[PDB]
Paper text:
Here, we report that GPR1 is capable of Gi signaling when stimulated with full-length chemerin or its C-terminal nonapeptide (C9, YFPGQFAFS). We present high-resolution cryo-EM structures of Gi-coupled GPR1 bound to full-length chemerin and to the C9 peptide, respectively.
To this end, we determined the cryo-EM structure of the full-length chemerin-GPR1-Gi complex to an overall resolution of 3.29 Å. The majority of the full-length chemerin sits on top of the TM pocket, with interaction between the N-terminal β-strand of GPR1 and the globular core of chemerin. Analysis of the chemerin structure, which was not experimentally determined before, identified an N-terminal α helix (H1) followed by 4 antiparallel β-strands (β1-β4) and another α helix (H2) in parallel with the β-strands. There is chemerin binding region 1 (CBR1) at the N-terminus of the receptor that interacts with the β4 strand of chemerin. Multiple polar interactions were observed at CBR1, where S23NT and E25NT interact with R93 of chemerin, and S26NT forms a hydrogen bond with L91 at the β4 strand of chemerin. There is also a chemerin binding region 2 (CBR2), defined by the TM binding pocket that interacts only with the C9 tail of chemerin. Of interest, another pair of polar interactions is found between E109 of chemerin at helix H2 and H1945.26 of GPR1 near ECL2.
Numbering used by the authors:
A (entry chain C): 1 to 58, 180 to 354
B (entry chain G): 8 to 62
C (entry chain S): 1 to 121, 136 to 247
D (entry chain B): 3 to 340
E (entry chain A): 14 to 319
F (entry chain D): 1 to 137
The structure:
């Protein structure tokens, strides 16, 4: 007969079913948002970068959220600035992120690291890159490489050649031969050539093209994963 | 620097003062505990299905 | 600030219509089930209707079914009882009662202050043989209630409730499930009993314990009250 | 003097090791050598709880073996009822990155914490009718890795800034702060008498702190990787630690020494959770092989496998009465076994 | 005594010759049997594995509804096999005709509509991410499923009004009566009914399926993603099956209209309609074998279901 | 004057009736309620409604005229919509006559709708073909 439950237990079943639905309806809204990580080498224009796509949404806190909307698409972006602990313990939390924004300031080729010596900032950023690009978790996650500080680097080229950071460089010390070389040197560390892709970009221009680029790239990643991870069902 | 080393040696000095027993006695207490409580262990000896609240 | 305030009562010609309101003030109207409870001018309590949380489940007393409708306005935090074809048997005090059903909850815990309606001129039976008893302050007194059906359900719960109505005051729940003490009720109250036989014991009775005590059942949702045991002196 | 201090510290280490050896004799296998084995323990999935649609990162039974609380990174704490399936509460979180949960012994409060460096204490028995944020303890720098209640007004947290802290819910400040770990702390387990508590760091060490004064008392060392889980023996005189090198070790408080190691040359993945059973004969350890194993606490031989999980198991609990064992993995689906 | 029979009504003429068994009839019967015995278990497996033993996605909703429609369509096949086995004899009463025809028509049209919507949803979901992230929820799925079922019922409704039964040459045929009251407009009624069936059931679904399944491939090739080998062969098989197993039935239904003007023949319509119906039932059986079972995800689940 | 075509139609209708398996004791034509005739470019069509009285003759003894009419037998009112061609060959025929307890309104409608189909037979080749005999819808 199945009517072995009291009135109170049937009301409890009612409460349980109301709860789970509320839960399902809430969780459906959390699957339509594109999630991005905001890895950065430090001492870059990360504040300027977050300001650039913050206007479109008109003790140590650790994780910092940033919500914004572009072309009817909702982006949540996670910044980890205050996390000085070991990266091997919380890096698997972001397993299902759509993309990893990776900020690099191409003006620290000559500026040696503070509180240290004979350790260039660019070398440290390169180590960070070939430290997250080969993670056993981020194997199908794309990287959007942002390259900041165009004007300062352009001014500094005429004063400091690039031979200091790359003694093996053979090209001329000017634009269109240093930026491309830097991007190429930053792209060879991608060991997973067949699965992930690098959407390199130059920035620090006071335009609105940065958010447009993130938009394009996230659309490509989405389409490719759909049409590859889905059949007929 | 030196303060960390001082605190570390002080802690290590404090540590080396407790009294310890033979491993045989600790094993004996452990064995006595596991033998004297095997009656109320639903996992060691499965409970009959009459008094099992889980199906 | 948990008060429930009733409104809409008054003198109504027989066969007419009247609407009663219950404005919850100071808590979430949703996540609660609501009950109406009726008390004749010189008679004990009598359950009227019940609407669950989310309005998914509705029940009526057979003496009012078809004539009455119960509803809720959750955004406005209001409970409504629309009342049609009013007979002379519907002159009473109507009370708005909240009750929440989950594991370990306390249904019927808070009662409204009630509104007055005067109309101008099977079911488990709860038995309280003792209509009145004289008690001296400082003494210990036991009230007995008896059931026509075993209130003890297969899940271990014995759906008996004890309420106290001090004269010129709204009912206040004392005990739920025949053994659990309410919040804010002193420990000198206690409840015990077997199936179909229950007792409420007041140890060292002192002032403000005088009044009418009611026993209400819920083995099956249908809830019937006792006649009421009245304590004086 | 750096050199003099290093030399005397080395000689202190040598003498403490010599004393630990001086209190060494025949081990457990020389006392368990003659005792009939338990046999083969076969378990069955009595119930399965679903509705999280994310990764499960923690769980904790109540004092009565009926209610449990689970935390997931969909931004949800859920209070399941073990008997039947109904949910009593579904609390949303301000921060959706949570790695801990805890059930108060009185059953009146719940706790949560994660990458936000803040411990949230949620109330359960309110007049209004909703689950509120009773307290928000802040003051840690790194993430919170474990959080266990001690009373209805005290709570011990172990964080990623290489510190543990005994709080005070009323005032909200650190009543006491335990330091001395040169690495992240990712474990916590309170003694039955709630006076001493042990913690295992990320530098392969387990320290036994005294709650009253707040000074380290004993340090047990030896491992090949980090420590991910710690649980006290029911007697309150020993504990078992799980690491990333596929080894679970047993340490004794009165002997300052290792007793047994439950390792097999067939498993290489680490251990995510460790829990004894009542009467202290079965040690249940959850692995990254999407299954948990049951070891004899004396014979140190595998005697059961629970492999009803798809992804890696992350939380494991045994009820107070020893009736059932509930596991939670990275694909929702909390499962109760008996 | 001799008594009497309730009533007799012998409408016949010797100008025509009766139906007899031929080569095509046995093929049609074996096709019906094969389709039934291979479509009941597959549909049952799909409905059990999708409706209950799984979650509720959107694609699973599409396949749930399609499997339900195909299973209900195949359930009432034995009535048709019994009708066609006894040289087109129908003894189950008049009302069961009006019921069975309505059920078959409704199931067929619902299945065709669900194939069309599966194709369109597949293309939109696999090409447009921004558009898909909105307007793709459970509420919209329920609304469109309800609309599809209502439209299919409305399309199948007229069979409940026009169907009838007539005795003829020691038989009892079940047919569509377009000559209810007057024969002045029966031509118009027959034409509008068959042309509506042809347009809604054949032209629109085939055009939509081809357009979506070709635009998806063209855009993917433009984006240079090198679609898998399982695709372009799990896609080009379903279209081929639809066009082979549904065209030589609408063809015959269209030829049916030439009765009014001139055909001077009956053998062509004598054998070829049972074969067409056999092909349609074969498609209804083959839908879940080719749509969900062949897919790697369901096979992986089946292997993991041990 | 009464012609011979209606006689041929009525007699063939009665012969078809006397081919009755279950109902024995064949009737005999007594009074004709109505009998109309019409020529078509393909043949002569006759519609009849006639009254028959049960007779003591055997069903095999209907052609013989010595049958004795019994007024206390049974009465029948039967309709025959038939048409013939050259050499008065019967090609299309429909006979009908149920019990007065029937509705006789839907029956009349369907009998007229089928007699019209009988009328156009022969002139239209596929007259006796109903739309949708072999399909399931
Ligand atoms: C013989 C004919 C009438 C059968 C058609 C009626 C039934 C089978 C149809 C009509 C309405 C349909 C239901 C309406 C929508 C839903 C919700 C979704 O979860 C799919 C199943 C379900 C529940 C459908 C199942 C099939 C359905 C029940």
């Amino acid at each position: 007969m199945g009517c072995t439950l009291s009135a109170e237990d049937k009301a409890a079943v009612e409460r349980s079913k109301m709860i789970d639905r509320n839960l399902r309806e809430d969780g459906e809204k959390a699957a339509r948002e594109v999630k991005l990580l905001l890895l950065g080498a430090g001492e870059s224009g990360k504040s300027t970068i977050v300001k650039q796509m913050k206007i479109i949404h008109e003790k140590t806190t650790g994780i910092v959220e940033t919500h914004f909307t572009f072309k009817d698409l909702h982006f949540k972006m996670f910044d980890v600035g205050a996390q000085r602990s070991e990266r091997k313990k919380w890096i698997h939390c972001f397993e299902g992120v759509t993309a990893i924004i990776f900020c690099v300031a191409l003006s620290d080729y000559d500026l040696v690291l503070a509180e240290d010596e004979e350790m260039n900032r660019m070398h440290e950023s390169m180590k960070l890159f070939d430290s997250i690009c080969n993670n056993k978790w981020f194997t199908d996650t794309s990287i959007i490489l942002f390259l900041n500080k165009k004007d300062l680097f352009e001014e500094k080229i005429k004063k400091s050649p690039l031979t200091i950071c790359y003694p093996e460089y053979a090209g001329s010390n000017t634009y269109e031969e240093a930026a491309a070389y830097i991007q190429c040197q930053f792209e060879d560390l991608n060991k997973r050539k067949d699965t992930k892709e690098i959407y390199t970009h130059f920035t620090c221009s006071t335009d609105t093209k940065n958010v447009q680029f993130v938009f394009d790239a996230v659309t490509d990643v989405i389409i490719k994963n759909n049409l590859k991870d889905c059949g007929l069902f | 620097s030196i303060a960390q080393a001082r605190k570390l040696v002080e802690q290590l000095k404090m540590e080396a003062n407790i009294d310890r027993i033979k491993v045989s006695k600790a094993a004996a207490d452990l064995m006595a505990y596991c033998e004297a409580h095997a009656k109320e262990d639903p996992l060691l000896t499965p409970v009959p299905a009459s008094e099992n609240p889980f199906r | 600030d948990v008060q429930l305030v009733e409104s809409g009562g008054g003198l109504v010609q027989p066969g007419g219509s009247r609407k009663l309101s219950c404005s919850a003030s100071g808590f979430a109207f949703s996540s609660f089930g609501m009950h109406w409870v009726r008390q004749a001018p010189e008679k004990g309590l009598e359950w009227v209707a019940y609407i669950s949380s989310g309005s998914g489940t509705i029940y009526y007393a057979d003496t009012v079914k078809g004539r009455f409708t119960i509803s809720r306005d959750d955004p406005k935090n209001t409970l409504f009882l629309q009342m049609t074809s009013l007979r002379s048997e519907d002159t009473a005090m109507y009370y708005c009662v909240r009750s929440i059903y989950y594991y370990g909850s306390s249904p019927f815990d808070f009662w409204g202050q009630g509104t007055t309606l005067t109309v101008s001129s099977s079911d488990i039976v709860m038995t309280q043989a003792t209509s009145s008893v004289p008690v001296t302050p400082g003494e210990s007194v036991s009230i007995s209630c008896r059931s026509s059906k075993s209130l003890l359900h297969s899940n271990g719960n014995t759906y008996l409730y004890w309420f106290l109505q001090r004269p010129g005051q709204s009912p206040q729940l004392l005990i739920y499930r025949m053994s659990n003490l309410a919040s804010g009720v002193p420990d000198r109250f206690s409840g015990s009993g077997s199936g179909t036989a229950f007792t409420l014991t007041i140890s060292r009775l002192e002032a403000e314990d005088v009044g009418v005590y009611y026993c209400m059942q819920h083995l099956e949702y249908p809830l019937t009250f006792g006649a009421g045991t009245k304590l004086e002196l | 003097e750096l050199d003099q201090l290093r030399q005397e510290a080395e000689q202190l280490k040598n003498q403490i090791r010599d004393a630990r050896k001086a209190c060494a004799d025949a081990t457990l296998s020389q006392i368990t050598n003659n005792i009939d084995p338990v046999g083969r323990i076969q378990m069955r999935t009595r119930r399965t709880l679903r509705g999280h649609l994310a990764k499960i990162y923690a769980m904790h039974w109540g004092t009565d073996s009926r209610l449990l609380v689970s935390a997931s990174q969909d931004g949800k704490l859920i209070i399941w009822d073990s008997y039947t399936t109904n949910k009593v509460h579904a609390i949303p979180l301000r921060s959706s990155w949570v790695m801990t949960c805890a059930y108060a012994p009185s059953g009146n409060y719940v706790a949560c914490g994660g990458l936000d460096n803040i411990c949230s204490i949620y109330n359960l028995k309110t007049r209004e009718g909703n689950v509120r944020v009773s307290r928000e303890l802040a003051g840690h720098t790194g993430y919170l890795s474990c959080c266990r209640f001690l009373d209805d007004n005290q709570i011990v947290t172990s964080s990623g800034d290489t510190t543990c802290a005994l709080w005070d819910i009323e005032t909200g400040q650190q009543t006491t702060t335990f330091t001395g770990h040169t690495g992240d702390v990712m474990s916590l387990s309170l003694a039955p008498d709630t006076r001493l508590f042990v913690s295992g760091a990320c530098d392969a060490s387990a320290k036994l702190w005294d709650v009253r004064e707040g000074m380290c008392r004993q340090t047990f060392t030896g491992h090949e990787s980090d420590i991910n889980a710690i649980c006290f023996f029911p007697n309150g005189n020993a504990f078992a630690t799980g690491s990333d090198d596929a080894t679970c070790r047993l340490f004794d408080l009165r002997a300052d020494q290792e007793l047994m190691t439950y390792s097999h040359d067939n498993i290489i993945c680490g251990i995510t959770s460790v829990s004894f059973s009542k009467s202290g004969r079965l040690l249940l350890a959850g692995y990254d092989d999407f299954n948990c194993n049951v070891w004899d606490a004396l014979k140190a031989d595998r005697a059961g496998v629970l492999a009803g999980h798809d992804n890696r198991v992350s939380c494991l609990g045994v009820t107070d009465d020893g009736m059932a064992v509930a596991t939670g993995s990275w694909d929702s689906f909390l499962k109760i076994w008996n | 005594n001799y008594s009497y029979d309730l009533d007799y009504y012998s409408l016949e003429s010797d100008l025509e010759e009766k139906v007899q068994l031929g080569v095509v009839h046995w093929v049609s019967l074996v096709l019906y049997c094969l389709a039934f015995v291979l479509g009941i278990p597959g549909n049952a497996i799909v409905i059990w594995f999708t409706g209950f033993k799984w979650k509720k996605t959107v694609t699973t909703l599409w396949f749930l509804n399609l499997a339900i429609a195909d299973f209900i369509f195949l359930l009432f096949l034995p009535l048709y096999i019994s009708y066609v086995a006894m040289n087109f004899h129908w003894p189950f009463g008049i009302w069961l005709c009006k019921a069975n025809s309505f059920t078959a028509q409704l199931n067929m049209f619902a299945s065709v509509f669900f194939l069309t919507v599966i194709s369109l949803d597949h293309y939109i979901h696999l090409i447009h991410p921004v558009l898909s992230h909105r307007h793709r929820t459970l509420k919209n799925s329920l609304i469109v499923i309800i609309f599809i079922w209502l439209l299919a019922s409305l399309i199948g409704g007229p069979a409940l009004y026009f169907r009838d039964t007539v005795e003829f040459n020691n038989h009892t045929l079940c047919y569509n009566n377009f000559q209810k009251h007057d024969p002045d407009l029966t031509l118009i009624r027959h034409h509008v009914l068959t042309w509506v069936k042809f347009i809604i059931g054949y032209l629109f679904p085939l055009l939509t399926m081809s357009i979506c399944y070709l635009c998806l491939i063209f855009k993917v090739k433009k984006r240079s993603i090198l679609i898998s080998s399982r695709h372009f062969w799990t896609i080009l098989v379903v279209v081929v099956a639809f066009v082979v197993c549904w065209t030589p039935y609408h063809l015959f239904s269209i030829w049916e209209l030439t009765i009014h003007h001139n055909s001077y023949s009956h053998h062509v319509m004598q054998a070829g309609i049972p074969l067409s119906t056999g092909l349609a039932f074969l498609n209804s059986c083959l839908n879940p074998i080719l749509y969900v079972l062949i897919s790697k995800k369901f096979q992986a689940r089946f292997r993991s279901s041990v | 004057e009464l012609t011979e075509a209606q006689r041929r139609g009525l007699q063939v209708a009665l012969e078809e009736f006397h081919k009755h398996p279950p109902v024995q004791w064949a009737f005999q034509e007594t009074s004709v309620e109505s009998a109309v005739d019409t020529p078509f470019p393909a043949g002569i069509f006759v519609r009849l409604e006639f009254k028959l009285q049960q007779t003591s003759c055997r069903k095999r003894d209907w052609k013989k005229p010595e049958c004795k009419v019994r007024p206390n037998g049974r009465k029948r009112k039967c309709l025959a919509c038939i048409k013939l061609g050259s050499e008065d060959k019967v090609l299309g025929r429909l006979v009908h006559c149920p019990i007065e307890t029937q509705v006789l309104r839907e029956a009349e409608e369907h009998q007229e709708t089928q007699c019209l189909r009988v009328q156009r037979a022969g002139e239209d080749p596929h007259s006796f073909y109903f739309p949708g005999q072999f399909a399931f819808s």
